[PDB]
């Protein structure tokens, strides 16, 4: 119901320091199960997740092999950009895509994604139909002509719709242990006095997946979206994740607030008070 | 075209002094992904410290989390040492147990 | 798994 896999490749240039590294890391909904890094000794994709791990010998190969050849083709695409935007030799660049598949609860495709960005800003993107491109600048179509010419689009939304999906219903199947069982958030408010006139209450969301919920504060009822601080969703580093929403409070009016909380691994929305 | 990171210094559990628990400095919604992330005990550097693969968010930013594993108490001072290209100077951000 | 297709920009 609404799972997805993702590529994500990145490239840095290093002028006078040899070859740009390649790195790429693999994710399953939130949870990353591969990474491959150019510079290793023995460049080999590797496991990061143990429902991978069952894979085989020609398994490995194979994506180790992939990213060998990317490593080197985006070499060639950096020194092309490069060339595109009239740029010295001297300045390190980036060249960063993401790509895969989002499948729907019938198992199939619903969404297939293939972006590429130049130096932090978007430069071409295959569009929603799987057969047209969005090119961000007169340098993104000199690409999209050599993509065109190439068929491109073609052969992406061919994996996009095949095997890309298959895949991911795979790794879901022999994941299912982790990837198909939300782990909702253990909720907490806590209370700290700023002085005599008021207090901080923070409400706590701690080791839930996946990453996505909703923290809101609530004065008899309605909202403070303006009053609240609401920190950026952060791993805990075992692969779960951690959130906090707080609010300036009168002292003595704590009894006006609670807090809201939506997660899919809950049965129910939480509300919680100090 | 650069940007600059958004830091967290947090705990992996919640701190119990005497626990023994894991250390976390989140970078993240930075341009370039070149970046230099030390965490410290008492102003001093922690070696074997360990972070994530780089990875990047939907509008291309990079994120990435530093950790170790650590022992809190109630005088022991922890924080997050950052550098990047976006920085004129270090940026220092303190641990506390109550965010 | 990783798409096999390979295209210079």
């Given at each position: 119901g609404s799972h997805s896999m993702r590529y994500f490749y990145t490239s840095v240039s290093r002028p006078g320091r040899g070859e740009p590294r390649f790195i790429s890391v693999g994710y399953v909904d939130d949870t990353q199960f591969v990474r491959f890094d150019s510079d290793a000794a023995s460049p080999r994709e590797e496991p990061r997740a143990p429902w991978i791990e069952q894979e085989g010998p020609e398994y490995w190969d194979r994506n180790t092999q992939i990213c060998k050849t990317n490593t080197q083709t985006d070499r060639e695409s950096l020194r092309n950009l490069r060339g595109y935007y009239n740029q010295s030799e001297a300045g390190s660049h980036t060249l960063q895509r993401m790509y895969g598949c989002d499948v729907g609860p019938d198992g199939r495709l619903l969404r297939g994604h293939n972006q590429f960005a130049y130096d932090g800003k978007d430069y071409?993107?295959?569009?929603?139909?799987?057969?047209?491109?969005?090119?961000?600048?007169?340098?993104?179509?000199?690409?999209?002509?050599?993509?065109?010419?190439?068929?491109?689009?073609?052969?992406?939304?061919?994996?996009?719709?095949?095997?890309?999906?298959?895949?991911?219903?795979?790794?879901?199947?022999?994941?299912?242990?982790?990837?198909?069982?939300?782990?909702?958030?253990?909720?907490?408010?806590?209370?700290?006095?700023?002085?005599?006139?008021?207090?901080?209450?923070?409400?706590?969301?701690?080791?839930?997946?996946?990453?996505?919920?909703?923290?809101?504060?609530?004065?008899?009822?309605?909202?403070?979206?303006?009053?609240?601080?609401?920190?950026?969703?952060?791993?805990?580093?075992?692969?779960?994740?951690?959130?906090?929403?707080?609010?300036?409070?009168?002292?003595?009016?704590?009894?006006?607030?609670?807090?809201?909380?939506?997660?899919?691994?809950?049965?129910?929305?939480?509300?919680?008070?100090? | 075209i650069q940007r600059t990171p958004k830091i967290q210094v947090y705990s992996r559990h919640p701190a119990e002094n005497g626990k023994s628990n894991f250390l976390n400095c989140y970078v993240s919604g930075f341009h370039p992904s070149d970046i230099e992330v030390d965490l410290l005990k008492n102003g001093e550097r922690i070696e074997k410290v360990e972070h994530s693969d780089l990875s990047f968010s939907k509008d291309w930013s990079f994120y990435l989390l530093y950790y170790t594993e650590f022992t809190p108490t109630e005088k022991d001072e922890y924080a997050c040492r950052v550098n990047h290209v976006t920085l004129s100077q270090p940026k220092i951000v303190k641990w506390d147990r109550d965010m | 798994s990783h798409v096999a297709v390979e295209n210079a920009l």
């Amino acid at each position: 119901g609404s799972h997805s896999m993702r590529y994500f490749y990145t490239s840095v240039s290093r002028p006078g320091r040899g070859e740009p590294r390649f790195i790429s890391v693999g994710y399953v909904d939130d949870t990353q199960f591969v990474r491959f890094d150019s510079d290793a000794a023995s460049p080999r994709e590797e496991p990061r997740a143990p429902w991978i791990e069952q894979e085989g010998p020609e398994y490995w190969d194979r994506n180790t092999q992939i990213c060998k050849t990317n490593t080197q083709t985006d070499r060639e695409s950096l020194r092309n950009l490069r060339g595109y935007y009239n740029q010295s030799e001297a300045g390190s660049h980036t060249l960063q895509r993401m790509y895969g598949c989002d499948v729907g609860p019938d198992g199939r495709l619903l969404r297939g994604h293939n972006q590429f960005a130049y130096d932090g800003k978007d430069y071409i993107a295959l569009n929603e139909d799987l057969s047209s491109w969005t090119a961000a600048d007169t340098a993104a179509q000199i690409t999209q002509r050599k993509w065109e010419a190439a068929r491109v689009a073609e052969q992406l939304r061919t994996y996009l719709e095949g095997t890309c999906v298959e895949w991911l219903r795979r790794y879901l199947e022999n994941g299912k242990e982790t990837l198909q069982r939300a782990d909702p958030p253990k909720t907490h408010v806590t209370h700290h006095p700023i002085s005599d006139h008021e207090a901080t209450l923070r409400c706590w969301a701690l080791g839930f997946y996946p990453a996505e919920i909703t923290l809101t504060w609530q004065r008899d009822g309605e909202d403070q979206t303006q009053d609240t601080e609401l920190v950026e969703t952060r791993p805990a580093g075992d692969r779960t994740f951690q959130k906090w929403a707080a609010v300036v409070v009168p002292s003595g009016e704590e009894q006006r607030y609670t807090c809201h909380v939506q997660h899919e691994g809950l049965p129910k929305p939480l509300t919680l008070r100090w | 075209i650069q940007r600059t990171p958004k830091i967290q210094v947090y705990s992996r559990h919640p701190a119990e002094n005497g626990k023994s628990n894991f250390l976390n400095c989140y970078v993240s919604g930075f341009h370039p992904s070149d970046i230099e992330v030390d965490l410290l005990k008492n102003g001093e550097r922690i070696e074997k410290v360990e972070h994530s693969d780089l990875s990047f968010s939907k509008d291309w930013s990079f994120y990435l989390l530093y950790y170790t594993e650590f022992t809190p108490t109630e005088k022991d001072e922890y924080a997050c040492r950052v550098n990047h290209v976006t920085l004129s100077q270090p940026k220092i951000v303190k641990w506390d147990r109550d965010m | 798994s990783h798409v096999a297709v390979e295209n210079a920009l």
